[PDB]
Amino acid sequence: QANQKRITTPYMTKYERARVLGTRALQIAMCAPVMVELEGETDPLLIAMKELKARKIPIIIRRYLPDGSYEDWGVDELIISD
Amino acid sequence: MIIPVRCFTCGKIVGNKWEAYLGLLQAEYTEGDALDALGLKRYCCRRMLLAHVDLIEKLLNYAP
């Protein structure tokens, strides 16, 4: 699929947000590098959540289409609503 | 099966009132007058003496 013309919604779905926080929390729990500041954050959930609010999560969401194609949308390109 | 020691509500001793209560009833006293003579004014203690069933007396009919 041509990345110049992505027809999916520009907002991040509640499910995409759930899986992003979950996988990123797992990564942080496995001693992965952190992108943002950690003033008083240790619980991987709170760290992944602050990273989402900061928009500094290094994950790409591969939205599969029914036809078989896919669109790779990065966490920085999507608009967080909640 | 035996008369409690204290009244569940207030805490007044009633364990020493059962035998006296029966001793008054056999003396042709009414249950109300008997409860008044024992000093049970609150309906909670009167509940304890008027609603009790001496089941232990039947348990002693069985050999030990």
Partner: protein, 49 residues
Amino acid sequence: DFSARTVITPDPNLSIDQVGVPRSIAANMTFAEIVTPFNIDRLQELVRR
């Protein structure tokens, strides 16, 4: 696994998102928490406990 069941009770002192779990059920059920330099201390104390 990692489930439980018991009778419920009202508790107006808890938020709508809170649940009062007894200490027995909480003691028998566990959660596999990964070790990190941020929790190595707490998890250590809990292991020795």
